[PDB]
Enzyme design. Sequence first.
Site, short mmCIF file in Angstrom:
data_model
loop_
_atom_site.label_atom_id
_atom_site.label_comp_id
_atom_site.label_asym_id
_atom_site.label_seq_id
_atom_site.Cartn_x
_atom_site.Cartn_y
_atom_site.Cartn_z
N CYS A 165 0.84 -1.18 0.00
CA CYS A 165 0.00 0.00 0.00
C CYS A 165 0.89 1.23 0.00
O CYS A 165 1.59 1.51 0.97
CB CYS A 165 -0.92 -0.01 1.22
N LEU A 166 0.88 1.94 -1.12
CA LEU A 166 1.66 3.17 -1.27
C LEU A 166 0.87 4.36 -0.74
O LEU A 166 -0.34 4.25 -0.50
CB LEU A 166 2.06 3.38 -2.74
#
Length: 166
Positions: A116-117
Site C-alpha cells: 500500500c503506497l
Amino acid sequence: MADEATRRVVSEIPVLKTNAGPRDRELWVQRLKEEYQSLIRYVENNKNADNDWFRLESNKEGTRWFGKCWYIHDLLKYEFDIEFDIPITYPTTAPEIAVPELDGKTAKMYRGGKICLTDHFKPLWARNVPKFGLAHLMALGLGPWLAVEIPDLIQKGVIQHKEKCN
Ligand SMILES: [Mg+2]
C-alpha cells in the site's frame, strides 16, 4: 518539492514511449523492449551507486513478473521475494507490487501482500503516463515503501536478516 524530488530520483532512468498494454500485440512487444532497456539502465545506475537492490524477470509474454529485493539496515541485509501482474490497462494503470511474505506483518499492505503506497503515488504516475514504467515503479513505489516499512518490521522484530555486512 515534489517535482524536484521526482526529477532527482528518475533523471537517469530511460523514459518510456509506447502507450500499450499486454493485449496490444506488436505494440506490447515494443513496450516490453522499452521496459527492459529502462530496467537494465536503472540496474546499471544502481550498481554504480552501491545500491543494487533488486532483480526482476518475467514470463515470455511479459505479463507476470517476479524477483527479489534487498534492504540493508544496521549492517544487516534482508531479502524479500516480490511479484506482480501487468494490468490490462497498463501503462495507464500502475502494477500492484506484492511482497507476499510480509502479509499481515504491516498495516501498509492489502490482504494478499500487495504493498500500500501513499496517496501521492497514483496521481504522480497518472500525470506522467506513459513515460513511467517498471523501473519507475521500483524507484518511486517499492523503494520508498521499503525505506519506511522494513525499519518498522525490524524494530518490531518480526523479520530476520539473510546475511550480515561487515
Ligand atoms: Mg526469502
